[PDB]
Each structure stands twice: as structure tokens, then as C-alpha cells.
Design a protein around this ligand. Sequence first.
Ligand SMILES: [Zn+2]
Ligand SMILES: [Zn+2]
Length: 83
Amino acid sequence: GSFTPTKKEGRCRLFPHCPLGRSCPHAHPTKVCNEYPNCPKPPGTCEFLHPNEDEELMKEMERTREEFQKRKADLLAAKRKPV
Ligand SMILES: [Zn+2]
Ligand SMILES: [Zn+2]
């Protein structure tokens, strides 16, 4: 932990599982970084994605995407059949 009066260095913490992705004040990483691997941001502060540090974050994004795909597969398999 820590006891300093300092504010956040970037990056949202509930993400990808955050409901305010429209008006939330903290950075949702939804794009691959312009300057990776050369980035001065420590792991868990950059506005973008890094296919080495934030590689587990890309896995968490795929996890919620395949969950949402399974929810859409159930919708198209109701009053209708999959094909
Ligand atoms: Zn957020
Ligand atoms: Zn970066």
C-alpha cells in the first residue's frame, strides 16, 4: 500500500469489465501502443496495449469477447436456429 496525496498515473482498473465506457475518467486500453516496446509507462498505466506486459489484458479482452459471442449464439438459437 501507500499514504501519499498523489493521483492516478493512468489506466482503469475494472477494465475490460467496466460499465462507464462512454464517460469514465480513467484510461481504457483499446488500441495497441504507438511506441511499444520502448514505453516509459510502467505496467498498468499506459492508455494503450502492450503484447508482453498487457498480454494477459488481451487475454481478458478475448475472455469477455468469447463470453459475449456465446450470449449472441444463444440469441440466434432462440426463435431461430444456428447456421
Ligand atoms: Zn472505467
Ligand atoms: Zn505504451
